[PDB]
Write an enzyme that holds these catalytic residues in place. Sequence first.
Site, short mmCIF file in Angstrom:
data_model
loop_
_atom_site.label_atom_id
_atom_site.label_comp_id
_atom_site.label_asym_id
_atom_site.label_seq_id
_atom_site.Cartn_x
_atom_site.Cartn_y
_atom_site.Cartn_z
N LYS A 170 0.82 -1.22 -0.15
CA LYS A 170 0.09 0.10 0.03
C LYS A 170 0.84 1.13 -0.17
O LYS A 170 0.34 2.25 -0.59
CB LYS A 170 -0.80 0.03 1.11
CG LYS A 170 -1.99 -0.81 1.06
CD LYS A 170 -1.61 -2.40 1.38
CE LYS A 170 -1.36 -2.57 3.07
NZ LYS A 170 -1.58 -3.95 3.50
N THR A 171 1.85 1.28 0.53
CA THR A 171 2.92 2.18 0.52
C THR A 171 3.31 2.74 -0.66
O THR A 171 3.44 3.82 -1.21
CB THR A 171 4.13 1.66 1.54
OG1 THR A 171 4.84 0.79 0.64
CG2 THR A 171 3.98 1.55 2.62
N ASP A 227 2.92 6.46 6.39
CA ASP A 227 2.87 5.24 6.13
C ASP A 227 3.02 4.35 7.60
O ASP A 227 3.48 5.10 8.44
CB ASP A 227 4.12 4.80 5.56
CG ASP A 227 5.61 5.13 6.07
OD1 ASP A 227 5.45 5.55 7.19
OD2 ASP A 227 6.37 4.66 5.50
N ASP A 228 2.36 3.34 7.69
CA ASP A 228 2.42 2.44 9.06
C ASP A 228 1.74 2.87 9.88
O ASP A 228 2.50 3.15 10.99
CB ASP A 228 3.75 1.85 8.66
CG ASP A 228 3.98 0.90 7.62
OD1 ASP A 228 2.95 0.35 7.03
OD2 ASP A 228 5.14 0.59 7.19
N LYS A 233 -8.60 17.17 10.14
CA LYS A 233 -9.73 18.21 10.05
C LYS A 233 -9.34 19.80 10.06
O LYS A 233 -10.09 20.58 10.16
CB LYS A 233 -10.66 17.90 11.41
CG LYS A 233 -11.30 16.36 11.30
CD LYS A 233 -12.13 16.45 12.70
CE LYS A 233 -13.47 17.18 12.63
NZ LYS A 233 -14.21 16.95 11.63
N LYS A 281 4.44 -8.67 -1.48
CA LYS A 281 5.83 -8.52 -0.89
C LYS A 281 6.51 -10.05 -0.37
O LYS A 281 7.59 -10.14 -0.85
CB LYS A 281 6.04 -7.50 0.12
CG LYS A 281 7.29 -6.93 0.80
CD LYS A 281 7.61 -7.63 2.06
CE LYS A 281 8.81 -7.34 2.34
NZ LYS A 281 8.88 -5.79 2.60
N1 LIG Z 1 1.40 -3.55 -8.12
C1 LIG Z 1 1.92 -4.02 -7.16
N2 LIG Z 1 1.34 -5.07 -6.41
C2 LIG Z 1 1.85 -5.74 -5.59
N3 LIG Z 1 2.96 -5.33 -4.97
C3 LIG Z 1 3.63 -4.39 -5.47
C4 LIG Z 1 3.01 -3.50 -6.47
N4 LIG Z 1 3.94 -2.43 -6.76
C5 LIG Z 1 5.12 -2.67 -5.80
N5 LIG Z 1 4.96 -3.64 -5.09
C6 LIG Z 1 5.75 -4.16 -3.99
O1 LIG Z 1 5.37 -3.88 -2.60
C7 LIG Z 1 6.57 -3.93 -2.07
C8 LIG Z 1 6.46 -3.11 -0.84
O2 LIG Z 1 6.37 -4.04 0.41
P1 LIG Z 1 4.95 -3.61 1.49
O3 LIG Z 1 4.66 -2.31 1.50
O4 LIG Z 1 3.66 -4.57 0.83
O5 LIG Z 1 5.40 -3.96 3.07
P2 LIG Z 1 4.19 -3.24 3.99
O6 LIG Z 1 2.97 -3.37 3.08
O7 LIG Z 1 4.56 -1.72 4.13
O8 LIG Z 1 4.16 -4.05 5.12
P3 LIG Z 1 2.96 -4.21 5.85
O9 LIG Z 1 2.19 -5.18 5.42
O10 LIG Z 1 3.51 -4.60 7.36
O11 LIG Z 1 2.29 -2.72 5.81
C9 LIG Z 1 7.65 -3.97 -2.81
O12 LIG Z 1 8.33 -5.07 -2.89
C10 LIG Z 1 6.98 -3.60 -4.07
O13 LIG Z 1 7.79 -3.83 -5.23
#
Ligand SMILES: Nc1ncnc2c1ncn2[C@@H]1O[C@H](COP(=O)(O)OP(=O)(O)OP(=O)(O)O)[C@@H](O)[C@H]1O
Lengths: 511, 79, 79
Positions: free
Chosen positions: A322-323, A376-377, A404, A481
Amino acid sequence: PDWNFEKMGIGGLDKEFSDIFRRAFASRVFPPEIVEQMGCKHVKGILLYGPPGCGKTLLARQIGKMLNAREPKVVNGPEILNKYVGESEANIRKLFADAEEEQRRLGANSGLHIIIFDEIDAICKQRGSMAGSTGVHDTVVNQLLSKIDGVEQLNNILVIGMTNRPDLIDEALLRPGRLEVKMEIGLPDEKGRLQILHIHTARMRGHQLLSADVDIKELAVETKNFSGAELEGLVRAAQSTAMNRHIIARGDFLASLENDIKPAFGTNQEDYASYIMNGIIKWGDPVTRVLDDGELLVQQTKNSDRTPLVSVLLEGPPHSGKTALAAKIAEESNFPFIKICSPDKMIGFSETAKCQAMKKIFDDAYKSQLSCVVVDDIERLLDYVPIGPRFSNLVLQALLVLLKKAPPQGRKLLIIGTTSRKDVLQEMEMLNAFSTTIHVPNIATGEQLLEALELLGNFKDKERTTIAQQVKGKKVWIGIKKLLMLIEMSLQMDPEYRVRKFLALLREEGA
Amino acid sequence: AFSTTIHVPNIATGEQLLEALELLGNFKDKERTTIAQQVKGKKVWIGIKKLLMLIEMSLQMDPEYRVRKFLALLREEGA
Amino acid sequence: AFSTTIHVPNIATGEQLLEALELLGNFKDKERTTIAQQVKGKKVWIGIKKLLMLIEMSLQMDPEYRVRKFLALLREEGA
Ligand SMILES: Nc1ncnc2c1ncn2[C@@H]1O[C@H](COP(=O)(O)OP(=O)(O)OP(=O)(O)O)[C@@H](O)[C@H]1O
Ligand SMILES: Nc1ncnc2c1ncn2[C@@H]1O[C@H](COP(=O)(O)OP(=O)(O)O)[C@@H](O)[C@H]1O
């Protein structure tokens, strides 16, 4: 009238200098024979606030050059604080006392002794009076104002205040007559920047080192937000390529090249990589429709006059990147101002240090016209744990008021959370405050999985035929990921054992 | 400690809601009337500061899908 | 540790009420005839420091709706 900006020194802010000229400094440039009747006493002091690097300190000296003092003495606040009580306030007393001699000596026809404080905002914290929390430095300011508006008042003086935090200053320091008038500086518009570029070029154009293929009109606007200070360094960097051009052995733009190097005050392009490893891998419709939705409601803001603030969070199960999606949504419209707020760098901080990084980021952002900011997070910086409920109340409190909190009129922004679990938040009442949400389902199915793997191209048709044969049927629920994680773990294997390692590991995912 | 209190009612009524649209003029007669056919004899409980975001979020859309997602996102909130 | 206590009662009777109003003199006898017939037989729990807000908050209306609002407000607390 000596106020024209055909004089080169500064530019782009013409209205604001006009204003100070209008009401602040008209008394001092006018024939005195009239006012000597009216007895109108001049402004002793002025305040101007704004972002740091916007060329305020060349305004002050320029008015000193404009209306001649003997010279300015400029000081920095922290340059005077002493552990030893006497020293700090005494310094200020020396500064003022330099003038009083001429004033009393030569009466009321003396020339100005001018003062400048580079940043007051530490020393001029607003004292408040009670038995506790008297203050640490609350006694220097008394000496200061007693010089300003004090006994044996003097008309021989001018004093410039400077800050980037205008709200902490005591209200009596700036009450009328002591400093009556305030001005705001804001990050310059493209017009001001083409003027500034004209300035710093004005020698180069005259010396004709850079004769060609240089247009300030485009080169100003290609950057929507910069500080006039960095541009001079930019021009210096632009001066460096011609000298770095003769390492090989009359000047060229390298600006289009070097703009990628520069961290702005505003947007940065070099922070994605840590967040974006792989770019945006579209495995299916949900991904693209989501970021399409992002591109959808971003336009809402940019085309709305009644909703400066908007907010969403991308929820979904963990390890769905999601980040990264939020980062791309930022990167997609080529915004003026984007910034990350993350625990990675605010790590190992107290509940009130990370807050002061966050208020810093938003009030930094408020003064841009259009912006996108991302946090994030949420769970992490909120310091959530299920075992016990434990978190810092302070953070979400100070965060949601910002959700807000409308910025000043005419400036707009959206804000983006990446929270991976929202049940807590619904319970913790951040979810009514956000406008709306996005479910980001992780991949639920193999028919989408192998498609994604074809986009990556790690595995052969046979390695992929294996998957296609064995499970079409299961709905696998997996964050991506982790997918990458374990393919890279199986990518290292004896090739015969490569694939079924992946499969066996994959069937340990839960739910 | 407080002397007295006053309850601001949220907006229950579709007609009352419709009047605000009539007042603001974000939507035209054709769609507003479509809503009138759609929603009348109905009680809707939603927030005003919520409403702003709804009408605008739809008001940026193409017209055909504009209202459709509007009342869809509205009916996202039943009470 | 406290050697003794005193329960302070709260106003229990329209009798004590209306004689307090005889004392203040804000409301004259004519309207009070109405309030008399209203209170008798019923009990009141309200303390006066809240009353002395109610008095003027009602007072600031026009005279006709004056007393009806006064008592109608007091319905909430007396119940
Ligand atoms: N379209 C996509 N679909 C899925 N994953 C992707 C996409 N584009 C990029 N990513 C991948 O998402 C990964 C980032 O990790 P991710 O943000 O999922 O950890 P996180 O979600 O922050 O951890 P948590 O789940 O604890 O929040 C990267 O390796 C990135 O390449
Ligand atoms: N027209 C202009 N607008 C903005 N900045 C300018 C302009 N002209 C010059 N500058 C630069 O603005 C900078 C201001 O730096 P300084 O005042 O020393 O730090 P701060 O601005 O943080 O107080 C100067 O270094 C100067 O080179």
